[PDB]
Amino acid sequence: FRVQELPLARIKKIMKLDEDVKMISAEAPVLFAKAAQIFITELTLRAWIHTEDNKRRTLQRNDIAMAITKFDQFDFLIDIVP
Amino acid sequence: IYLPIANVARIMKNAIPQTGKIAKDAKECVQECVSEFISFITSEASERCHQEKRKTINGEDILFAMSTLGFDSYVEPLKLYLQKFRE
Amino acid sequence: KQLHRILKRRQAR
């Protein structure tokens, strides 16, 4: 997968939901596209620890929920995966 | 307000063993997590830009918010990606 | 590290 494929307009739309965002630099969505690929990859690998620990080969939402509890960097997902 | 599910799923598939499977609701979960990540970082950058009376969220503001919030390891690969994107 | 930003994001959501 090529990071350039992610739609910058969608990243900008998400940023623009913020109540204090006025203008956004051109580079901000580009940086978030690469960050999104790093984040998805690390989160998926950390969830897959629990998939295999449960003797499964299908990654499930509960595996993501468990991964979020075991890494401080994912503390901000506490409400997204309850 | 989400990245396309097929792109999210392709990145997830590249992370796990070639024989593994990903349930549809796990792809959807990660889709939501990504959007929250973007909003979470943006909120930190936007409060800082407001405190400084600046009207534009710049790349340094996003990188600094990531560094402050536990994602300092992202700063160097992002800088390289952006530079290469623009060269 | 993330706690204050989390508290804030909850009000935004």
Enumerate the domain spans of chain A.
4-82
Could you give the CA distance from residue A14 to residue A11 in angstroms, rounded to a whole number? 5
Task: Classify residue A8 as exposed, middle or buried by CB count within 10 Å of its CB (0-12, 13-18, 19+).
Answer: middle
**A27 to chain B nearest CA, in Å?**
6
This structure was determined by X-ray
Contact present, B66 and A11 (Cβ < 8 Å)? no
For residue B70, the tally of other CB atoms under 10 A from its CB is 16
Q: Find the helix packing angle between B24-51 and A8-16, rounded to 10°.
A: 60
A76 with C12: Cβ contact below 8 A: no
Helix H or strand E encompassing B32: helix B24-51
Could you say which residues from 33 to 52 on chain A have a Cβ atom under 8 Å away from some Cβ of chain B?
A: 34-41, 43-45, 47-48, 51
Residues of A in contact with B42 (CB under 8 A): 14-15, 18, 21
* HSE-CB of A65 using CA atoms within 13 angstroms: 8
Give one word for B39, left, alpha or beta, with left for phi > 0 and alpha for psi -120 to 50.
alpha
Residue whose tokens read 């979960």:
B29
DSSP string, chain A: --GGGS-HHHHHHHHHTSTT--EE-THHHHHHHHHHHHHHHHHHHHHHHHHHHTT-SEE-HHHHHHHHHT-GGGGGGTTT--
Give one word for B53, left, alpha or beta, with left for phi > 0 and alpha for psi -120 to 50.
left
At how many Å resolution was this determined?
A: 1.4
**Nearest of B4, B9, B2 to residue B39 by alpha carbon:** B2
In CATH terms, the superfamily for domain A4-82 is Histone, subunit A (1.10.20.10)
Could you give the CA distance from residue B53 to residue A56 in angstroms, rounded to a whole number? 51
In CATH terms, the superfamily for domain B1-87 is Histone, subunit A (1.10.20.10)
